[PDB]
Amino acid sequence: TIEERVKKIIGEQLGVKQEEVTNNASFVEDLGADSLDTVELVMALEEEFDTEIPDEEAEKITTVQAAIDYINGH
Amino acid sequence: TIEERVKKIIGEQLGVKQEEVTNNASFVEDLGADSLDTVELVMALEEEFDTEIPDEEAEKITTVQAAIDYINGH
Amino acid sequence: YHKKVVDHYENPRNVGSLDKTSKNVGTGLVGAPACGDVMKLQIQVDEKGKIVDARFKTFGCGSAIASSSLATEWVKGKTVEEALTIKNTDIAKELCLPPVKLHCSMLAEDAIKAALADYKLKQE
Amino acid sequence: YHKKVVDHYENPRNVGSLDKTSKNVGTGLVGAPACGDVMKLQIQVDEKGKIVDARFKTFGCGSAIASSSLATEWVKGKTVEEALTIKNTDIAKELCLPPVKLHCSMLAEDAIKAALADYKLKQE
Amino acid sequence: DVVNVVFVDRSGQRIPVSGRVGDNVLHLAQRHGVDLEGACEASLACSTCHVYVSEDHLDLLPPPEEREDDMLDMAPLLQENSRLGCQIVLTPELEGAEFTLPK
Amino acid sequence: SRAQVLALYRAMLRESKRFSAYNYRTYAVRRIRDAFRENKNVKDPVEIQTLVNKAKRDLGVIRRQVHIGQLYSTDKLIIEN
Amino acid sequence: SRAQVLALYRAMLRESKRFSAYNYRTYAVRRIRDAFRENKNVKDPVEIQTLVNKAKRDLGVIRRQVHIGQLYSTDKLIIEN
Amino acid sequence: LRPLYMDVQATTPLDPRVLDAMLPYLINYYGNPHSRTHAYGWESEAAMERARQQVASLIGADPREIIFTSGATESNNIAIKGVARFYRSRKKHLITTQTEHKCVLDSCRSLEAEGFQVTYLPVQKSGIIDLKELEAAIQPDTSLVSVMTVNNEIGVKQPIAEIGRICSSRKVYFHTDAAQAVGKIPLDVNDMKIDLMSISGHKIYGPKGVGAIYIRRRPRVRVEALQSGGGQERGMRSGTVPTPLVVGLGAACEVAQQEMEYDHKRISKLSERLIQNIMKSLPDVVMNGDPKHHYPGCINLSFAYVEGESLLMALKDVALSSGSACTSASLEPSYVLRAIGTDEDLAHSSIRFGIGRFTTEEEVDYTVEKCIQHVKRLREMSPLWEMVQDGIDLKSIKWT
Amino acid sequence: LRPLYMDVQATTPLDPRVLDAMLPYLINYYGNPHSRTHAYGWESEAAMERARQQVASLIGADPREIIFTSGATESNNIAIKGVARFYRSRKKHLITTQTEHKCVLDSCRSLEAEGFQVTYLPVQKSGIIDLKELEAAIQPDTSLVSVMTVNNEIGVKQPIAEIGRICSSRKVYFHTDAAQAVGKIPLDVNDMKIDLMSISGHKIYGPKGVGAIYIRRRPRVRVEALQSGGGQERGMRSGTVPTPLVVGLGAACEVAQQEMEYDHKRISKLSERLIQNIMKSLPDVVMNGDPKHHYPGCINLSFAYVEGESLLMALKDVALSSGSACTSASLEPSYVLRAIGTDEDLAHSSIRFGIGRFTTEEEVDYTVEKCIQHVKRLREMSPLWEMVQDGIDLKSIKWT
């Protein structure tokens, strides 16, 4: 399941205990993560799902929902 | 001039004194050159004229006429 | 490390002990901890003159452990007289022990002889 | 090698010779103490007590060639008395010679002094 | 056929020993009470028969064998006059030779 | 200069993950993460430029060493299984 | 043989002409040419196969060293101008 | 699959930043640095001087005090033998400790054969020398004192600064073998009053076959050269200077100066993790050496009733070292462990663990797990363990 | 643009095949070859044994007779000092030549200070020693004879096999410095009856900082160790063996063995080209050393009435060497050229050209053209040339 895998990746990267991660939680505001955390989260998504995410779409990925939508679409 | 440059390259590579090279002299039968000589002549042509000669056309290049035709076409 | 020695450690055969009170059990205990090699070779004799069970416990290097294991394996199935025939040269030849490791074969032989002597003395 | 030494060799200044038969020319020819360095320094004097020309030829190292060239350049335009004030420390300061290279400067000073002595002896 | 040698125990005391040709130095010492070990019993594996040979008589000995030299280079306190006692054989050329036991 | 730092950080991480040797790979990822976390609050623009130049030299070294370690590579570690 | 040898010869020459260093480039080109001239009249198939294997191993060495010399390049010689 | 490397005290991997600095001189700048008439020599010479300044900067010295060698073995030989032979006419006495490296100990024995008197200081059970014995061992005839900074076998640290103060008060040259300390703990030759110091390249993630010795110039210390030749390295070490090697050594020193604090805190964390996790799981495990004067990167443990070589052979997926006579070609028991008063039984049981610049928590955890399981298996095979668990004292038992 | 390299006697560029063999041990196989308990050490030890076999194969020896060193300086010190000290009780006399390398000459001078007697054999004007003088110089208390194979200054070859026969007949150990000969001219230690040989890695397109010494085992040559330590290399050289360096030395020896005949033919032709083209265009040019017993790769020419370092300064685009005292740090004249009876004036005019494995015909022609032009420019500048061309003899002229 793409949903559970994406949520697991985000939880393992940002230490959200798998409970705080929701479909409307932002990477920076809701969860505790700076711009050095989100670069690595995006790269971990690229590692798990083989996809060279362009810089524009990477900076568009700011929320769990955005990452979910990108991974499901691609 | 393409003609003169090709003739000069062939003469320098095979030591034909710039006089023996004609438009119907073959590399092996007419001039004194083996296959080791040819791989070096074709590479010199590829160095002077920037062109990645395929193997199929390189094995077709057996005479001065063939080399001139290939260089002029490409 | 040599393949035979590594196999002797990685696959144990007869690691254990036996009852010292039983009249049909001999016990060998040779080497000193200060020296760094200690072996406990134990044999069992049935009603007739045949060895039926053997156990060992060895404190020492891989070569000492292999030497004790091979000594126990070769001891089981023989009689007292045939067990006395085992020399350190055979153990060293089988394990391909380099000259620095010749103590392991000598001390395994000494453990064999000590166990046999204990059996005879206590059977008297 | 240093900038000035390189320039003094690569760009000749007064390499040549002067007629020894001429009465108005003094010639020096001196050598190094502990190496193969030879300098020929020749100065010329006009009717009045002024040096109008000076030429050198040197068999030696690059620093020696540079020292001779600088000595000729500094001698030109001076009088005998003003030239006697030239010392090896000044040449060394201008060429930035390392400690192993002061033999060239001392040779250049000796050549200057020898040529001036030759001028006085011949003009007597 | 009698050859007289001198043994020098570690103390430095000189022990004159009389022997005959065809004997072994290590054993001649053992019979005459010299503290030379012969631990490997002349099988060329111990270096305990180590001895220093006198300067004059050294070249009169036969050149050592390959295993004799292999044992010597491990033998402690090696010198240019070192041989192994279990390989020297008494010969008429060895009269007056002095064997010194290394410390 | 936020964009240049986020881009150089990403380049340096994606570079270090291509090290063939386990020790070098784990080291370069850990060090870069720790070094950029160490300098998150540095205010002086001169110091920030000096750090960005050292990071560029560091990235050049990582590129050359990753390539060379690809040219001469060996078996993976027992922990990597 | 005629085709594989001629293919290996062309590959070796192509790779050697990419050496950054003048000494290595010139030596490699000359050595390859001389060796192939020396072994042109060999008749033993086993000897020919052994020579091909040796040349393949040298091709590998040439590829790796050309790359590392491109990673670490210097100025050209006074004679190349 | 290759085993994990946990043996940094034996040698270190090359730092990629060191290899990167080295490669240009292995490809293009191949000139001889003592060629003084052309550009290959000039650029090689410049690189050599740059590396010399890097080493001096790491240890707080002037560059003119750094002499490149082929390793810390040669550095120790130069220090001890050269100082002793230069000052032979007045000073015939040397002082060192019983726990020194063997290059130092063997140089001292060769001098003792050449006519010198040598005192070998004992150490306490902590592995640290006692300064009163050091003070009482000094003669008007004393030339040199040689005490190492970090022990290569158990990781204890000697009071180097105090030793140097005492030596300067008594007017005796002080040498320290720092081959296990350079780039790992802070060092300052002027604050510790050090006269000679040995440095090794491949103990600090630099290349093998290169070293350095620091020789003080104010006040001037002189040595008698051991290697004769053309007077290179100020006349103290003749031969061609290996430019790629000294360039690598300088690069490693610069990297160490930049990375020391970060490395030390990480290595301390990892060493605490290792020791706690092993002690928390196995009874009768003992650390050798004093924890209060101890470098975290070198951990030496004894596993009672299990032989060190047997445990090492069991741990076929982790690279380590022992202190067993059995692990030696000469069947030599560990003299360091003998000197710190270890029971001969527990000396055959010691294992050395190394944590360095590239160790990960993953490897530390794997090593601890494998060690726990194999120590349990070997104890279940040990007769000594059987007797100990069965209410028997080892000392009272007769052994043959 | 960088200058051309014609200074191969000083050092060589690294062979790319050698670097290709070396790099795996600089990246992945970094273990200590003396580590006996794990796979890093096992693979390092195996690589070291392979290299030892390669060197022994090049020189025709048993691999057990090869000892790795840090260079030919260390090899020469081990040979000379070790033999002299080991056989001290009976043999107190040494023999070498006046044209030997300074590592050898300085070892002999230090032994003279140590209480030994040293004879320095003169050479004939060809640079070759007289065998009759050698036979006359041997005493009943002679320990060692040391003659180099190829001279690094003028490239003349000594009659090594004849010298070895004489030494074996007189029962005297024979050492040869072969640093300039290994991999370039044929060597067989058994055919030449050599007892000790020095080898240098960076003279044979191998890495710097490594070497080897050959010590015969049948009959057994023994040496007294100079570097004390842990007993590595059979106890003859203590310290950690630098695995990447010894692997590179082995690779260089294997490549030299494969390449030697082709290299020698090519180098002889290029040397002939250089010499003939310089001689056909310049008068009063002389070759130092006999052509009949000459290694073609080392060419030594004196350009009369031109100073060597000024010529070198003119040839700024070609890296060369000179025997001029003005190129020395200590203002030291060329003792080799003094020994072969060269006038000092012509000894200050000496230029050494080095032709090696990677030299090219274009480089040779460029060098010849530049040398002709600059010698003509400096002769036009020289007072010696002026007096000679003006009908004057240099000897008769007074000099101050």
Ligand SMILES: *P(=O)(O)OCC(C)(C)[C@@H](O)C(=O)NCCC(=O)NCCSC(=O)CCCCCCCCCCC
């Ligand atoms: P985000 O939450 O917006 O924050 C991102 C940054 C850090 C850019 C932001 O916090 C910021 O603007 N901070 C101000 C100062 C700043 O950006 N500092 C960082 C400077 S760059 C830096 O620290 C480089 C570190 C160098 C890496 C060396 C490691 C290489 C190892 C080599 C061995 C193989």
Ligand SMILES: *P(=O)(O)OCC(C)(C)[C@@H](O)C(=O)NCCC(=O)NCCSC(=O)CCCCCCCCCCC
């Ligand atoms: P053409 O007229 O068709 O002839 C070409 C060939 C050679 C194919 C032909 O003459 C032929 O068939 N001859 C029979 C033998 C033969 O094919 N010889 C080639 C054998 S392969 C060989 O000799 C390779 C040599 C190895 C090159 C090593 C170069 C080293 C470089 C190291 C640089 C660092």
Ligand code: FES
């Ligand atoms: S007696 Fe054992 S070696 Fe001679």
Ligand SMILES: [Fe+2]
């Ligand atoms: Fe000069």
Ligand SMILES: [Fe+2]
């Ligand atoms: Fe044992």
